[PDB]
Curated annotation (Swiss-Prot):
PTM section of the record: Acetylated by KAT8 in epithelial but not in mesenchymal cells, thereby regulating the epithelial-to-mesenchymal transition. Acetylation by KAT8 reduces KDM1A association with nucleosomes, thereby decreasing histone H3 demethylation, leading to transcription activatio of target genes.
Organism superkingdom: Eukaryota
Gene transcribed to yield this protein: KDM1A
Consequence of changing K318R: Loss of polyubiquitination
Residues recorded with modification Phosphoserine: S426
Coiled-coil residues: 256-329
Protein name per its UniProtKB record: Lysine-specific histone demethylase 1A
Alphabetical keyword list: Acetylation, Chromatin regulator, Chromosome, Coiled coil, Cushing syndrome, Developmental protein, Disease variant, FAD, Flavoprotein, Isopeptide bond, Nucleus, Oxidoreductase, Phosphoprotein, Repressor, Transcription, Transcription regulation, Ubl conjugation
């Protein structure tokens, strides 16, 4: 009940956060009874909002719907409601305001970028009564939430998955926007380059081996401190190669030991056969041989030698048996055959997809630093088209499209943002504001010849973080057919590449859209390179793979096709951040920190500024809410 609202808000139900201790020092330093009352007021307020997030939750309503003991204490209820509303925990997203916004606005903020982070922060600042203007370079909102819509076909070229609802703010948004979320079936048969499926035994064996290898790299990093080598940071790819080499060495060693067991037994057989030949000489000589006493003696001796031979013949058979078993029970010659390595490279490509970067670039120590904060519940696709979310957030906002920022000026007095119209470069716009919120992607901030100049130039710590962090890349190919020729009960199926270098080329296909749309993925080293290929050629290669899997006659020519090129997109310059070898979690926090030339003037939000939820739409959303709170605290 009330316990669940705190979980849905990413908070502990029986504890107080660092932030709450800072804002409510009287309660933390006071008696624990007041703390329990505080926590119930907070949890109950969150439950009221989450039960019905389509309408603003007012202080008055909170008092009206509160329990009898706690509705008496109104000052505490107000303090709690104000705290939650400011930080974007109870009144965020699209909601029906019960009271219109005041005509008088108390501050001027220019927000660069109209992605989820920008739109969320703008909606919050508007909610708080500030004058907000968004500058967006594209001819559309959403940024890295891009939805292709033509005829009946709807497909996401950017963000496409809600990674669980338990604790996800996107849950609330989904109720506000009426997102059509659909579960993804966890079933992905693999098909080799020839088009024949990977049998279950091999699929399962390789997958088990992939998981074992990855856990091994984790052990090296954390237990053995294998993190710095020859004054260079260890990449995940490095560690994977180290682990693979150790396993290959174990195979060679076991094979060698078995070889030696066989040679020793073979040597024993050779020695025994020589011994037997000698005994046959002896027996054949004694056979050639009181005289009746002599006969009795010779026959006695001959039977003794013959029984002596019998013992050795039994032992001959027994050593022959041991040798035969060893000849028929060897260990594997190689750890991974060619086909084994290709299937394993498919799994590596899936990892490169998840992190939108080649594994040789991921920090071994920190590439999965955010795994502790992952959300509960089945992962979901957006059937309505993820663009439905930003478009809903944009309603009622002062958004200037086709306006590309080229300079940001910030001083102790105020700020200037200079922008150019992309449609006609000749006309230029100047916007004077109190504060600037930058949600420019990390790729755009990384641009060596800068697209946006800062006056004064950004400080050393900020620029160093921007250099250190990784900004990955990942691409999609949308194929729209008239009929479904694939298996509807599999949302995913893989294509195993021929080379380790190209393992990430069209390695994955989604058939998750209930309409006849197929989505082919380009991860790792292939992502950057294949942007330089024409769309007809990429689609021909996709068709070739699908023909190989289903029959050349079974796949028609597609009716519609679309290719994303996110690294070339000048407004993205990649897909989303990843934790590069040089970088760590603290760099994300550094991105989030604002700049002061006094009070702070330049603020930062976006996918690359939230430690615990990077590379995600919900992370963008939460960063937007966080910076809205920060700016409202500063200017109100
Ligand atoms: C292929 C792909 C798939 C993804 N899949 C998922 C997924 O399944 N789940 C998930 O959670 N996340 C996913 N993401 C990541 C997700 O899209 C981001 O985490 C999120 O959209 C970040 O939003 P943002 O506003 O911070 O950045 P953006 O969306 O990039 O917003 C920045 C905005 O600034 C604009 N801009 C850029 N330069 C300028 C300029 N000079 N002047 C003015 N405006 C400018 C851009 O046009 C853009 O609108 C995916 C990303 C990619 C590339």
């Amino acid at each position: 009940g009330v316990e669940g609202a705190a979980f849905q808000s990413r908070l502990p139900h029986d504890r107080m956060t660092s932030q709450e201790a800072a804002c409510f020092p009287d309660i933390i330093s006071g008696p624990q009874q007041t703390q329990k009352v505080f926590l119930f007021i907070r949890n109950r307020t969150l439950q009221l909002w989450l039960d019905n997030p389509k309408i603003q939750l007012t202080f008055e309503a909170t008092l009206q719907q509160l329990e009898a003991p706690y509705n008496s204490d109104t000052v505490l209820v107000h303090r709690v409601h104000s705290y939650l509303e400011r930080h974007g925990l109870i009144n965020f997203g699209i909601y029906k305001r019960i009271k219109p916004l005041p005509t008088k606005k108390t501050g001027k903020v220019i927000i660069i970028g109209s992605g989820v982070s920008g739109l969320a922060a703008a909606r919050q600042l508007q909610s708080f009564g500030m004058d907000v203007t968004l500058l967006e370079a594209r001819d559309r909102v959403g940024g890295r939430v891009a939805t292709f819509r033509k005829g009946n076909y709807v497909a996401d070229l950017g963000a496409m998955v809600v990674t669980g609802l338990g604790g996800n703010p996107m849950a609330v948004v989904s109720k506000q926007v009426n997102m059509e979320l659909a579960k993804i079936k966890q079933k992905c048969p693999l098909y080799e380059a020839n088009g024949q499926a990977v049998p279950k035994e091999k699929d399962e064996m390789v997958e088990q081996e992939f998981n074992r290898l990855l856990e091994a790299t984790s052990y090296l990093s954390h237990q053995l401190d294998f993190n710095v080598l020859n004054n260079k940071p260890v990449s995940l790819g490095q560690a994977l190669e180290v682990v693979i080499q150790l396993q290959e060495k174990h195979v060679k060693d076991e094979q060698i030991e078995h070889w030696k067991k066989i040679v020793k037994t073979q040597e024993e057989l050779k020695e025994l056969l020589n011994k037997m030949v000698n005994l046959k000489e002896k027996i054949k000589e004694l056979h050639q041989q009181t005289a009746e006493f002599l006969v009795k003696s010779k026959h006695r001796d001959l039977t003794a030698l013959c029984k002596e031979y019998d013992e050795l013949a039994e032992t001959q058979g027994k050593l022959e048996e041991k040798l035969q078993e060893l000849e028929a029970n060897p260990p594997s010659d190689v750890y991974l055959s060619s086909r084994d390595r290709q299937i394993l490279d498919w799994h590596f490509a899936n990892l490169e997809f998840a992190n939108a970067t080649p594994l040789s670039t991921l920090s071994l120590k920190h590439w999965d630093q955010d795994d502790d904060f992952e959300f509960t519940g089945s992962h979901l696709t957006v059937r309505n088209g993820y663009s439905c979310v930003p478009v809903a957030l944009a309603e009622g906002l002062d958004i200037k499209l086709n306006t590309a920022v080229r300079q940001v000026r910030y001083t102790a007095s105020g700020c200037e943002v200079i922008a150019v119209n992309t449609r006609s470069t000749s006309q230029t716009f100047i916007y004077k504001c109190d504060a600037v919120l930058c949600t420019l992607p990390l790729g755009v901030l990384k641009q060596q010849p800068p697209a946006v100049q800062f006056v004064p130039p950004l400080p050393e710590w900020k620029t160093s973080a921007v250099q250190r962090m990784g900004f990955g890349n990942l691409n999609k190919v949308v194929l729209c057919f008239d009929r479904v020729f694939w298996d509807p009960s599999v949302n995913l199926f893989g294509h195993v590449g021929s080379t380790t270098a190209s393992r990430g080329e069209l390695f994955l296909f989604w058939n998750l859209y209930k309409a006849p749309i197929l989505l082919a993925l380009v991860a790792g080293e292939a992502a950057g390179i294949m942007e330089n290929i024409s769309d007809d050629v990429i689609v021909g290669r996709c068709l070739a793979i699908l023909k190989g899997i289903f029959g050349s006659s079974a796949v028609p020519q597609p009716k519609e096709t679309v290719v994303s090129r996110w690294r070339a997109d000048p407004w993205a310059r990649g897909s989303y951040s990843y934790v590069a070898a040089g970088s760590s979690g603290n760099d994300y926090d550094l991105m989030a920190q604002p700049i002061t030339p006094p009070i702070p003037r330049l603020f930062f939000a976006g996918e690359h500024t939230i430690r615990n939820y990077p590379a995600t739409v919900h992370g963008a959303l939460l960063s937007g809410l966080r910076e809205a709170g920060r700016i409202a605290d500063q200017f109100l």
